[PDB]
Amino acid sequence: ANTFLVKEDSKNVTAYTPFATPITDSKSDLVSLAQLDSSYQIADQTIHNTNLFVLFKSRDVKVKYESSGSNNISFDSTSQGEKPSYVVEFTNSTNIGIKWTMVKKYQLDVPNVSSDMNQVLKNLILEQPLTKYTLNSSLAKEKGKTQREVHLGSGQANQWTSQRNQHDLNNNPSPNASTGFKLTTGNAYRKLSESWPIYEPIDGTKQGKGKDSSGWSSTEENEAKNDAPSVSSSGTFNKYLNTKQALESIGILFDDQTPRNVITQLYYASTSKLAVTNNHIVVMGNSFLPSMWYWVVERSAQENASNKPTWFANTNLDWGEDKQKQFVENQLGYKETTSTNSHNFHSKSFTQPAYLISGIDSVNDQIIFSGFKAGSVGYDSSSSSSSTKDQALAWSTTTSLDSKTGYKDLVTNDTGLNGPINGSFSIQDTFSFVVPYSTTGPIKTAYPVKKDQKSTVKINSLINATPLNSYGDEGIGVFDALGLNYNFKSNQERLPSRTDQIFVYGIVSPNELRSAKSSADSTGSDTKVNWSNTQSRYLPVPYNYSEGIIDASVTTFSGLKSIAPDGFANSIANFSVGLKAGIDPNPVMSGKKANYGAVVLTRGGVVRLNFNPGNDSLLSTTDNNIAPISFSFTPFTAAESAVDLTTFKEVTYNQESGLWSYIFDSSLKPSHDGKQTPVTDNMGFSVITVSRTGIELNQDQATTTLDVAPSALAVQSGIQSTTQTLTGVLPLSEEFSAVIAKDSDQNKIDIYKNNNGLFEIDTQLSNSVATNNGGLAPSYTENRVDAWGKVEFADNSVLQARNLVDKTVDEIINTPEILNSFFRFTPAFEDQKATLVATKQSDTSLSVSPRIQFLDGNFYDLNSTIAGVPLNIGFPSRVFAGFAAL
Ligand SMILES: OC[C@H]1O[C@@H](O)[C@H](O)[C@@H](O)[C@@H]1O
Ligand SMILES: [K+]
Numbered sequence: 001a002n003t004f005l006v007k008e009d010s011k012n013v014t015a016y017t018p019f020a021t022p023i024t025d026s027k028s029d030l031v032s033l034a035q036l037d038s039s040y041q042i043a044d045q046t047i048h049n050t051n052l053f054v055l056f057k058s059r060d061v062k063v064k065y066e067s068s069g070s071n072n073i074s075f076d077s078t079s080q081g082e083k084p085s086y087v088v089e090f091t092n093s094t095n096i097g098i099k100w101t102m103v104k105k106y107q108l109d110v111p112n113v114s115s116d117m118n119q120v121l122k123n124l125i126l127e128q129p130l131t132k133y134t135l136n137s138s139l140a141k142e143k144g145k146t147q148r149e150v151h152l153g154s155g156q157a158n159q160w161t162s163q164r165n166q167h168d169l170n171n172n173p174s175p176n177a178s179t180g181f182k183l184t185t186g187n188a189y190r191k192l193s194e195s196w197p198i199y200e201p202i203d204g205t206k207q208g209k210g211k212d213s214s215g216w217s218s219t220e221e222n223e224a225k226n227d228a229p230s231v232s233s234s235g236t237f238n239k240y241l242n243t244k245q246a247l248e249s250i251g252i253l254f255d256d257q258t259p260r261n262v263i264t265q266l267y268y269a270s271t272s273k274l275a276v277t278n279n280h281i282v283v284m285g286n287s288f289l290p291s292m293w294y295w296v297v298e299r300s301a302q303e304n305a306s307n308k309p310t311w312f313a314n315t316n317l318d319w320g321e322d323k324q325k326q327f328v329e330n331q332l333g334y335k336e337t338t339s340t341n342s343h344n345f346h347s348k349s350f351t352q353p354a355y356l357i358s359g360i361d362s363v364n365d366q367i368i369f370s371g372f373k374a375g376s377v378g379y380d381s382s383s384s385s386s387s388t389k390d391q392a393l394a395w396s397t398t399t400s401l402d403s404k405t406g407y408k409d410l411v412t413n414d415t416g417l418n419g420p421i422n423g424s425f426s427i428q429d430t431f432s433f434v435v436p437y438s439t440t441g442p443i444k445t446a447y448p449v450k451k452d453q454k455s456t457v458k459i460n461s462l463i464n465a466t467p468l469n470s471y472g473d474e475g476i477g478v479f480d481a482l483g484l485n486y487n488f489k490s491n492q493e494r495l496p497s498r499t500d501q502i503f504v505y506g507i508v509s510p511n512e513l514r515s516a517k518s519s520a521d522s523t524g525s526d527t528k529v530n531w532s533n534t535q536s537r538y539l540p541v542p543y544n545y546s547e548g549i550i551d552a553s554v555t556t557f558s559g560l561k562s563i564a565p566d567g568f569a570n571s572i573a574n575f576s577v578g579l580k581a582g583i584d585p586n587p588v589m590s591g592k593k594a595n596y597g598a599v600v601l602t603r604g605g606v607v608r609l610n611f612n613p614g615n616d617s618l619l620s621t622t623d624n625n626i627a628p629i630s631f632s633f634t635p636f637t638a639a640e641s642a643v644d645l646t647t648f649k650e651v652t653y654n655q656e657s658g659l660w661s662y663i664f665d666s667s668l669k670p671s672h673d674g675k676q677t678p679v680t681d682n683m684g685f686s687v688i689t690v691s692r693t694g695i696e697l698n699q700d701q702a703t704t705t706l707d708v709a710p711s712a713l714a715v716q717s718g719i720q721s722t723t724q725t726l727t728g729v730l731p732l733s734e735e736f737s738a739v740i741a742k743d744s745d746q747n748k749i750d751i752y753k754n755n756n757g758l759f760e761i762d763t764q765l766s767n768s769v770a771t772n773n774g775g776l777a778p779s780y781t782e783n784r785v786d787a788w789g790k791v792e793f794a795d796n797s798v799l800q801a802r803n804l805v806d807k808t809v810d811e812i813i814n815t816p817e818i819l820n821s822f823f824r825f826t827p828a829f830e831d832q833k834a835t836l837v838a839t840k841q842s843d844t845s846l847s848v849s850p851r852i853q854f855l856d857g858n859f860y861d862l863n864s865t866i867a868g869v870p871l872n873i874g875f876p877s878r879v880f881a882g883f884a885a886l
Helices: 115-121 147-151 160-167 213-227 244-249 262-270 322-332 407-411 475-482 510-521 763-770 798-802 809-813 816-820
Strands: 004-007 012-016 040-048 051-058 063-065 073-075 085-092 100-108 125-127 180-182 199-201 240-242 273-276 280-284 293-298 309-311 315-317 355-363 366-373 376-380 391-393 459-463 502-508 529-531 534-538 576-583 596-602 605-612 631-635 648-654 659-665 685-693 711-721 725-730 736-742 747-755 758-761 790-793 823-826 834-842 845-853 878-881
Touching: 004 040, 004 725, 040 273, 051 273, 063 262, 085 280, 100 293, 147 160, 199 213, 213 240, 273 355, 280 355, 280 366, 280 510, 293 510, 309 510, 322 376, 355 596, 366 576, 366 596, 366 605, 502 510, 502 596, 502 605, 510 529, 576 648, 576 659, 596 685, 596 711, 605 711, 631 711, 659 711, 659 725, 685 725, 685 736, 711 736, 711 747, 711 758, 747 763, 790 845, 809 816, 809 834, 809 845, 816 834, 823 834, 823 845
Parallel strands: 125 459, 315 529, 355 576
Antiparallel strands: 004 012, 040 051, 051 085, 063 073, 085 100, 180 391, 199 240, 273 280, 280 293, 293 309, 355 366, 366 502, 376 391, 376 459, 502 534, 576 596, 596 605, 605 631, 648 659, 659 685, 685 711, 725 736, 736 747, 747 758, 790 823, 834 845, 845 878
């Protein structure tokens, strides 16, 4: 397709030429054409093999979770909420213009619930979602019991050394290590059948009700409402933010002022992104809410099937080592043959149940994904003298200082594997949050349930709204979240978490997508998928997005000062958006296959994912000292960091340039603040351009293997505005972009020109391109250097003067270099090219008409079409006469 598809609104897609003009009648209500009702909106769209695949979801959708029976998750079929999300394949049925017709329609059904799964879902609890306005202090949660309070009691670290052997804690130096955080204050935690509030606590260390749902609605909700009342009032906001409009902006659904139940929000968020292969449609969730499931649709699915989603809790990833998997699985909750009705994901042999998915794409017949591990830990829901009551069980898993430095060794270090170990330690006359070693034998970690309460205790599963496991308001949590934990060695290597701020990526083969479909369709007990072409990576938020961190008074989440420039009030929770794959246009040594990669934005930088196209694997190298070479992180400068990542609108890739274009649109900002103040900086847009860097695979015998990861560079391109409403950005070429925007209520075309890496508006080219006189393409004027340069034809007297009269028309016509001498071209931009096309008119004469490059690098002439429609640009023709018939 010689066209650009532009989503004009939530229902309509219009086809645009490279001249930034709409193809007449191309505008299509794809919702109406999918035979869906007006409550449906376009979530995402992609081209595969010339057909258009669109993901729809409905603002009317209602889902319920019933703890008993066994079709536990269903749509609310009463009223009008039986509104599943749909993928639709459209094909263009005309050779002239655009007429979308529906080919195939696929319903995304609610997930199956096994007996085993439903025992976990029963007491599953989920944090209220993170917004734009969530503060470091909002996330902060009350520090839980120490490891020795849980095990021994109110009863002294004098008896810590005598006793740690009777509680499986041999040689453990960390009696004062935290066992997690309290669920009586903080961000609201709610079951699948409950609703999140519109209120966020300013200090979650004091003002939340956490999971104390019943406390919230009888006591604290009234307080929050009087403090933080929705705009018509104006309130004090001493204690609570009100983020209703910010919740709406991230796809939270509402019955008036009340958010719909969690299961509804999960389903609605879960149908956000699609990708398409020869055999499959894959649907995944957005970067804003955790998702617990994803669809694998078989494109052959009969004309009307219910395509079942696969649980992530049934989807085993390779985390890079078996050990990196154990760290995640051990902190999911208490496993035990001995305990009763104590059901969590770990105890029921499930794996990591939730991700904050960056996006999904396809290259060749492979699916590529990335996301953040959503924090998931056990909590103690006991009712009576249980010490950890109403407490989440979570702990830093950050590698000790003594660890073998060399990635393999850093990430497989035993520190905090089975339970708590870090807090604070003064070695010599200096200090560390990290345990200084990994004596009388090997150091032991144990799960913070004391031996006696082993058979009585109720440890259930929760899911956090961010990539942090541990919200506890201690020093280590800040250092875990911000990447500040360093060894004291030679080359001073950074010590990673493997539970907090963990990024996940992979490539998924068609067989691997087939097992997921088989897991989703499992009768009875849960079937499992293994995805083996996957990795994880400790990816903290840049420490320089915070201020005033003490060391040389220890700062925790409740006092940590955000200066985060990227649209988030918080400086501790990482975020990712716009994963996108592309084939490298740069040739490879022959007998090897084309290179491909993907990129994704995270807070403070771009990540490059590197694949080996030989066998559609993660790129790797033989040495385990150097870090999985499938991942590279390049930090942003100030200009990239100033971009509000919550305004991400779309990402395209151009195979000719080998460049990614990330579009940001400020109209996506919410109407109002957490203080209910109208947001006024919602005008404008921004483009970030991503390019590959480093030595790429298979250039020459030398680079058949690599021991340095290819990476990417994100550059705020110069294409931005604080004044215009965006309609679209057309990346015509590496040298040019067209922006369609409105100042008033009509669409204006701006041409941005790339000057040595920086895009600048070119007002003369803009005026040339915009002067199309209501046609599809820029006008042509003889006397003007316009979008088409300027052509001056030689006079007819050049034939006689050059003794070309002694040549025939047929000779001249088969000598392109003679007929390049019948004009002088002035280019409008450097290296714009032009040739003359010749036509015999008689035995003695011919005409010539120019063929001229536009900004896209394509040649146009009298016969040019877009979508089969003649452009009728207005190129001249010139007769030359007096040639011989020899
Ligand atoms: O158990 C920890 C203790 O080890 C002993 O050898 C020292 O007396 C203390 O300085 C230290 O706090
Ligand atoms: K011209």
